Amino acid sequence: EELAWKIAKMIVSDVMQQC
Amino acid sequence: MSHIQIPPGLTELLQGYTVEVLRQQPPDLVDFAVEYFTRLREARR
Amino acid sequence: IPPGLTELLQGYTVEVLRQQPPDLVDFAVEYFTRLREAR
């Protein structure tokens, strides 16, 4: 986490926006 | 120090699962995940 | 959006980022099977 958490959140948010 | 690796195909894999969830509306998301990814792996051969 | 979808996606994704598994679908099978067993 810390950066891994932030980046994961970014990726998930992008997936949810596209879907 | 403390770089994060993003592998290729991560976004696409997540998208494929998510689209199936939002359209099929399975009752148990974890059960569906096991079944979905297991079939994906089997079909890759 | 169904209950818990974001949580499932975040959990898997952050573990991919933390652990750097050699194969994403193998890891998915492993990760979600563990979750199923833990419940």
Explain the overall architecture:
The complex is a heterotrimer, with one copy of chain A (19 residues) and two copies of chain B. By secondary structure, chain A is mostly helical. In chain A, 84% of the residues lie in helices and 0% in strands. Chain A has one helix and no strands. Chain A is rod-shaped, with a radius of gyration of 8 Å. Chain B has helices spanning 10-24, 29-44. Chain B has one domain: cAMP-dependent protein kinase regulatory subunit, dimerization-anchoring domain (cAMP-dependent Protein Kinase, Chain A). Chain B is mostly helical. Classes of the chains: A mainly alpha (19), B mainly alpha (45). At the B-C interface, helix 1 and helix 2 of B face helix 1 and helix 2 of C. It is classed as transferase. The entry lists the keywords Dimerization/Docking, Regulatory Subunit. It forms a trimeric assembly.
Distinctive features:
heterotrimer, A: 19 residues, mainly alpha, 1 helix, 0% strand, B: 45 residues, cAMP-dependent Protein Kinase, Chain A, 69% helix, extended
